Amino acid sequence: NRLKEKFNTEVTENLMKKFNYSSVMEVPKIDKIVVNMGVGDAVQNSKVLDNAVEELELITGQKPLVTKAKKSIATFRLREGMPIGAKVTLRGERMYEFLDKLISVSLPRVRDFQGVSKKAFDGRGNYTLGVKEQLIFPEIDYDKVSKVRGMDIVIVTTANTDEEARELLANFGMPF
Amino acid sequence: MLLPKRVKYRRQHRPKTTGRSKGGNYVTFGEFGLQATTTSWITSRQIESARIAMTRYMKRGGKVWIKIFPHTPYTKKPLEVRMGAGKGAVEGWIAVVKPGRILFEVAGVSEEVAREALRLASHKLPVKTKFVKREE
Amino acid sequence: ASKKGVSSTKNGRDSESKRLGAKRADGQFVTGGSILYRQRGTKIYPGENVGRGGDDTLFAKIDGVVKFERKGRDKKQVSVYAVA
Amino acid sequence: MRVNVTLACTECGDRNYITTKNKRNNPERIEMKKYCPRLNKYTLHRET
RNA sequence: UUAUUGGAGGUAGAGCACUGUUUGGACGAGGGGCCGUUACCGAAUUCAGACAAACUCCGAAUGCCAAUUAAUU
RNA sequence: CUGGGGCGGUCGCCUCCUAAAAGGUAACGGAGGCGCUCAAAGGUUCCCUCAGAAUGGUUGGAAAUCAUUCAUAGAGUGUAAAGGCAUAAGGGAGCUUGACUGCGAGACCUACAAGUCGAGCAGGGUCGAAAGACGGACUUAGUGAUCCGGUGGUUCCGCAUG
RNA sequence: CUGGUGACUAUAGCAAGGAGGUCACACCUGUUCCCAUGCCGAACACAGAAGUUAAGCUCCUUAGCGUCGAUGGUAGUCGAACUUACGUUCCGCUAGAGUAGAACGUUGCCAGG
RNA sequence: CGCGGGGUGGAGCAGCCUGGUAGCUCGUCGGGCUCAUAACCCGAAGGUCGUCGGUUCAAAUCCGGCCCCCGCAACCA
RNA sequence: GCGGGGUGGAGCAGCCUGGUAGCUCGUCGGGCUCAUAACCCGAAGGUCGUCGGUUCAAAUCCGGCCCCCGCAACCA
RNA sequence: AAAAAUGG
Ligand SMILES: [K+]
Ligand SMILES: [Mg+2]
Ligand SMILES: [Mg+2]
Ligand SMILES: [Mg+2]
Ligand SMILES: [Mg+2]
Ligand SMILES: [Mg+2]
Ligand SMILES: [Mg+2]
Ligand SMILES: [Mg+2]
């Protein structure tokens, strides 16, 4: 819980001083992290979705929820109820461990890494990071990766504004 | 030629024609208007004839508003057929006009030009009319 | 004499009318089991001592006086109350 | 459902109920607990 | 039959809140010919004005069902 | 049947409008459905709430999956329409078979034959901690008299008697 | 006054601004235990009391939205008289829209203060 | 309703009688052939035998259930 | 009045049974010829008559507008 | 002893 200790000690004080919070309960915190992988080619080959689920489970540490089509779309040849994604929600210690790992061990493994988008905030204090290749994560061996596919990592925060969310993530150590 | 782009029902009961004008009894867009004083169906062809007459007299100087619209289809049987065997096919489109409704409005011209234009228009219509101004 | 060919209508169908609606009046005494109201859905709801049949028919469960009552802002119900 | 089905008590053999089933969805002889009036108890009935 | 009281219900009228129909403005989320700015602005929004047997946010007069109900019959 | 007959169309059942605010109400008037489906899409207990839009995000585009916000019903309700249903009748899960047996005060509808609703009682059950709910399905179509014959059951009869 | 739990067609709602905390209600700290997540102690469940009124919640102000809403007049209409006129007249009933205005709830029971 | 028969590579026929082995004629691919073209000759790929079961060391073959097609015959709610 | 049909340039399938546009000829390119034809190899070419509807999805299912074909149009 | 047209 090194990252959590940093948040309790340094980030809390820095952020509260910067934004003039009358109470500590106003200090933003990372509510959850949702790691999603949309596998639309599972329509054509379910083994792709199975491999994606296994890789996501290795990355995150817990079994993913398989997400199914909410509606049928002819162009995609998608029928309602067909499994076309995987999702993991991380909270608490696992969330913090994954976050520090992503900041330190994983993100620098990005090829030609030059920081993460600073404008990728929903407008209400939540940040979505699109990783373009799973090989980034240290838990995956490229030998067993039949196909390389990305992920969406949604950091959901209690910050009301992109400015506060940016300050929180920067203090945590996100490049920008 | 006005007519709805589509309707839910092409075969409709013909509208009630007794009573007074429910609405649109005041000049609201232009300065002058043509007010119906009797009741009639008004066809799209009659609307078009009156519109052309008044606009041609105004010589594009002013602006014209058609306040009525022929929403209602009416049917007619094929020639020389007996009664029964279903309702006939849509023949045309009509607006129901009762006393007091403003049929047309004009603006951007003198009162004299508006009077003459609306006179020419009224002679194309199956109702008696009167020249009206905005009230205040 | 000249006679023209006629077409046909594709219409000309209707189901039997179902005699829906109120079957007893507000303020009327009814015996238990009397149908109060025939309906589709709950246009009126069962109130006190009133049941709702499988086809939504409203009926009295006790002997008593029928009372149609407001139910909230938009709805209504029918109840039966025992007479003294 | 698209075919008629007779449910007979598997203890006394009485044909106590009729029902229906879809033959493609349930090709097998369907079974279920039903009340057997002769035995005055619930017994397993199955399609004849 | 009338008087009084209660109730069911959606017509006439009216209205546009829904489903459709429809006339003038204003403005344009955004892209194209255009350099930023003189089509389409098809969207959406918005102001005002209209139409309806199978529209209704509303809603009569009557008629109808009743009442330990009174008067006349 | 038929705005003469033939020809064409139609014939039973369900929903809406015509229908004149109870109910009913015709025409070869205006519109559509039905001759099924479901072993769960039934019962019960617990839990849940949509469609759509905006903004971020990789393969991913106007729409796939993820996140926040707004969004009161514009979604869904097997299947037409109407009436209902967001205290759900809509959605998920667990357990189940009441899609029971004998019935039935009373009531609707109605020329008859039929058709519809039904508390409650008894037997034996399912779910539920319990109250309680359950005699199919959000409701209303999905059906056809008698005679005759087939099949199963039967403390019924059995042409002198068995 | 606070809370719990009811009744009433939102006159009760929404929105905006402001105030509140040892009681209490929350957020909140955790996952050993009963219980739980199609993944997640988020939720449900349980154990607990370091911190906070930030949010919920409660209270206060208002009339922007929503809700309610006359009187008067008009449409429609039962009946009658006259009438065929896309009618007239008389009587009774009497909208919808709109206007003035009402309104930021009113109350029962119980336990605390 | 009874009795027979049929279902086999992309098409049309054997092999079922009597248990093993999937043959024949067209069709496609490659080669020889020729000035090409056809014809002809030689190499290959092509159905696991309508479907599900059953008896056997062994099933296209034997025995059942089921799905279609054909011939004749039967049919007084 | 009732039926049937409308799909590359032509003729004809595909519809019945929604997810898949086929054949012959014609056209274009390369080849063979002294050249043309024939022939061989390779390619392009139809928003399925036109508007609406149901559907996640329409040549296909449903309803109009148009065009063509066939049959019918009888008794005085 | 298969078939192989034409050329101002
Ligand atoms: K005139
Ligand atoms: Mg009206
Ligand atoms: Mg005649
Ligand atoms: Mg009625
Ligand atoms: Mg007979
Ligand atoms: Mg004997
Ligand atoms: Mg040549
Ligand atoms: Mg020569």
Tab-separated table of N, CA, C and O and ligand atoms in Angstrom, chain B residues 121-129, ligand 1:
chain	number	residue	atom	x	y	z
B	121	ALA	N	-57.252	38.215	-55.251
B	121	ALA	CA	-57.220	36.898	-54.626
B	121	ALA	C	-58.622	36.409	-54.286
B	121	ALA	O	-58.972	35.257	-54.559
B	122	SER	N	-59.433	37.264	-53.663
B	122	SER	CA	-60.750	36.841	-53.212
B	122	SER	C	-61.619	36.388	-54.371
B	122	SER	O	-62.443	35.483	-54.210
B	123	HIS	N	-61.455	36.992	-55.546
B	123	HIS	CA	-62.297	36.546	-56.651
B	123	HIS	C	-61.991	35.119	-57.096
B	123	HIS	O	-62.775	34.543	-57.858
B	124	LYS	N	-60.890	34.533	-56.644
B	124	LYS	CA	-60.564	33.151	-56.958
B	124	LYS	C	-61.138	32.158	-55.957
B	124	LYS	O	-61.020	30.951	-56.172
B	125	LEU	N	-61.738	32.625	-54.885
B	125	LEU	CA	-62.098	31.774	-53.774
B	125	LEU	C	-63.606	31.531	-53.705
B	125	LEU	O	-64.403	32.347	-54.173
B	126	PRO	N	-64.019	30.399	-53.153
B	126	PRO	CA	-65.451	30.105	-53.027
B	126	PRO	C	-66.114	30.678	-51.780
B	126	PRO	O	-67.185	30.208	-51.398
B	127	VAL	N	-65.506	31.662	-51.127
B	127	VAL	CA	-66.084	32.284	-49.941
B	127	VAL	C	-66.130	33.790	-50.127
B	127	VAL	O	-65.359	34.366	-50.897
B	128	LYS	N	-67.064	34.424	-49.429
B	128	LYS	CA	-67.054	35.867	-49.293
B	128	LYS	C	-65.978	36.282	-48.298
B	128	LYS	O	-65.705	35.588	-47.319
B	129	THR	N	-65.371	37.434	-48.549
B	129	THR	CA	-64.211	37.863	-47.789
B	129	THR	C	-64.313	39.349	-47.500
B	129	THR	O	-65.147	40.058	-48.061
K	1	K	K	-65.500	35.134	-53.919
